[PDB]
Amino acid sequence: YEEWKIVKREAPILGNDQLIENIWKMKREDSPYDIISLHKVNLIGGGNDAVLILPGTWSSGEQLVTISWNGVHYTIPDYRKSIVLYLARNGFNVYTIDYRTHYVPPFLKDRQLSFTANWGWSTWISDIKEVVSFIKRDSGQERIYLAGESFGGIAALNYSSLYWKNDIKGLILLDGGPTKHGIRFYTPEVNSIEEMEAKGIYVIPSRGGPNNPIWSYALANPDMPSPDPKYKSISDFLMDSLYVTGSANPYDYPYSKKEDMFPILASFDPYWPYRLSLERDLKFDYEGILVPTIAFVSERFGIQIFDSKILPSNSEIILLKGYGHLDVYTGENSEKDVNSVVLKWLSQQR
Ligand SMILES: [Ca+2]
Ligand SMILES: [Ca+2]
Ligand SMILES: [Ca+2]
């Protein structure tokens, strides 16, 4: 349990052979599935500094680097469309974490998932801490840049509220952070910890991931019939389902593409613990965080949901006009609107 063990050493990234990946794994407690992992990406010959990116719900560090799940590949990553690869190409040591969710078998159900009952904030925060400690030694930085996507932005802020003084020198929120008072991709099956155990429902399933091969089928066969007869094709149905949820804008700028969206949905982890959301009770102190911050907010999703008032005083807020949630993370226009802007912001800190 104690140590990080190397599992992939100096491995070139598919479609990006100037970039290399290292992966380490750490056993945690107390079930066989309590494992975390850490990915590092840098240019051949080395990168500098340290940026850690926290994935969002059902996401993983693996997804953030190779748009894959357990080595199952759905596409070839484009560094222009990937914050991790883009920052690594531009000279940074970039790291990203596989949460414990990345080790859950997709076929488990109901009470077989009871080992996730205490996958709450102290667990997640402890796992992020182990990664940060490793990064400091690996990169040589006393403090790091911490980025977060969606849920990962809340995680970044929560982590920072506890450890910013010794660990964090800059925050990058990519459509993620505390949401507004009572802000209403699932309808909750449980509403408390007691109900979770009473009903034996410990996780929220993804509508993508290994248990939903529809996305991958539809990328290869986009003109097949729609399961919902309102639409002319399966791809039409799936892309419009993303539109309706504020996840994509297929119809106007930034012109979300199935080639970008379907691989993301396909490569998610199957399950996410209820415990994190059921600990809405826990108060984190965001008042003292004196860290330079850049926050990106999608017009079609984030502005409606995310609360700007609770962020550090520094914060530069970038509104992404036309964007759905997932457009923040992929697509050819994300290079101009997100990735290059994060790089420029980082250059202003140095
Ligand atoms: Ca140092
Ligand atoms: Ca399916
Ligand atoms: Ca077809």
d(CA 15, CA 25): 24
Ligand nearest to the CA of 211: 2
Ligand nearest to the CA of 50: 1
d(CA 48, CA 298): 30
Q: Is 189 flagged in the annotation as binding? A: no
Please tell me the distance between residue 332's alpha carbon and the centre of ligand 1 in angstroms: 36
Q: What is the 3-state secondary structure (H, E, C) of 196-248?
A: HHHHCCCEEECCCCCCCCHHHHHHHCCCCCCCCCCCCCHHHHHHHHHHHCCCC
**CB of 274 closer than 8 Å to CB of 258:** no
Strands 48-54 and 144-149 come out as parallel
Ligand nearest to the CA of 143: 1
d(CA 88, CA 271): 29
Please tell me the distance between residue 215's alpha carbon and the centre of ligand 1 in angstroms: 44
In angstroms, the first-to-last Cα distance of the chain is 37
Please tell me the distance between residue 268's alpha carbon and the centre of ligand 2 in angstroms: 13
Resolution in A: 1.9
Please tell me the distance between residue 118's alpha carbon and the centre of ligand 2 in angstroms: 29
Q: Which two tokens stand for residue 221?
A: 């066969």
Which residue, 64, 91, 77, is CA-closest to 15?
77
Please tell me the distance between residue 225's alpha carbon and the centre of ligand 3 in angstroms: 9
Question: Alpha helix (H) ranges present in 90-183?
Answer: 121-139, 151-167
Which residue, 179, 152, 174, is CA-closest to 294?
174
**CB of 204 closer than 8 Å to CB of 274:** yes
Ligand nearest to the CA of 218: 3
Q: In whole angstroms, how far apart are CA 341 and each of 159, 174, 212, 320, 334?
A: 24, 11, 34, 11, 10
d(CA 85, CA 280): 33
**Cis peptide upstream of residue 138 (ω within 30 degrees of 0):** no
Please tell me the distance between residue 295's alpha carbon and the centre of ligand 1 in angstroms: 27
Give the three-state DSSP class for 205. strand
* DSSP letter, residue 337: I
If phi over 0 gives left and psi between -120 and 50 gives alpha, with beta otherwise, what is residue 70? left
Q: How many residues does the chain have?
A: 350
Q: Is 332 flagged in the annotation as binding? A: no
Which residue, 98, 96, 97, 101, is CA-closest to 31?
101
Which residue, 183, 212, 208, is CA-closest to 306?
183
Which residue, 200, 205, 11, is CA-closest to 115?
200
d(CA 31, CA 108): 14
Ligand nearest to the CA of 222: 3
CATH topology of domain 1-350: Rossmann fold (3.40.50)
Please tell me the distance between residue 45's alpha carbon and the centre of ligand 1 in angstroms: 20
Segments of the chain assigned E as strands:
5-13, 16-27, 35-43, 48-54, 68-69, 72-73, 92-98, 144-149, 168-174, 203-205, 271-273, 293-298, 316-320
Q: Which two tokens stand for residue 24?
A: 């380490």
Q: Which two tokens stand for residue 255?
A: 């012109």
* DSSP letter, residue 101: G
Torsion of CA 154, 160, 163, 168, to 10 degrees: 130
| Residues 62-74 as b or e (16 or more Cβ within 10 Å = b) | bbbbbbbbeeeeb
Q: Which two tokens stand for residue 159?
A: 């982590």
For this PDB entry, the determination method is X-ray
- For the chain, breaks with the C atom over 2.5 A from the next N come after 184
Q: Domain residues of the chain, as ranges? A: 1-350
